[PDB]
């Protein structure tokens with residue numbers, strides 16, 4: 001009886017196994033765009049993904065992860081609110097059963113169809129398991145998805161999904177360039193928060209881009225063909241794998257842009 005996104009094991013239940021679910025810096029949050037303050041001291045973000053090495057795509061039972069080689073500084077995030085160098089380890093998405101829901105962060109209470117998380121860890125902590133025990137251990141770049149025109153750089157991800165339909169399946173996934181997932185602008189909001197799934201550790205500097213990327217209806221429909229279950233188990237479609245907004249508590253959301 002482990003955590004998930006159903007009636008009986010979804011977000012409102014997680015606190016019983018993970019009491020930090022009710023902590024002081026949980027994610028996601030609603031981004032009130034009128035209350036976020038421009039911070040002219042924030043630097044532009046530096047996204048350096050030209051040397052990225054994707055390796056594998058995995059259905060882990062709660063999303064799919066595209067994993068990278070993070071044994072060297074190859075694809076890194078720096079600048080912005082960050083001190084130091086954060087290495088890309090994986091990306092994944094959260095999405096809905098309908099186009100009107102799916103994102104974890106919201107903007108003035110608006111839900112997007114999906115949200116991409118590019119997860120990076122602070123190299124001063126040596127590896128990822130150590131980083132998630134630190135308050136500045138991770139930087140997750142969040143990018144909203146709206147349904148409209150297709151995103152050509154997403155199609156290679158969409159097309160491999162039928163090979164990882166069920167929990168615990170993985171497939172080779174080399175030479176994927178995550179630059180094709182980014183919007184044109186790197187304007188962002190940033191705040192200190194947490195992992196959005198158990199163990200819900202309070203180790204993340206969140207950087208959420210203001211500009212969404214567009215994806216087609218057909219692209220998101222393929223996300224919704226994935227399964228939460230393992231092979232040979234009753235089919236339960238992987239949809240609505242998002243945690244709702246949590247209380248902001250004693251935090252301020254900063255904007256990189258006026």
Ligand SMILES: NS(=O)(=O)c1ccc(-c2cc3ccccc3[nH]2)cc1
Nearest residue numbers: 117119132140194195196197198199
């Ligand atoms: N949705 S999210 O990007 O906040 C996210 C990123 C990473 C994890 C994440 C899960 C986990 C489990 C054991 C050890 C380290 C871990 N990092 C969870 C959520």
Ligand SMILES: [Zn+2]
Nearest residue numbers: 092094117196
């Ligand atoms: Zn996520």
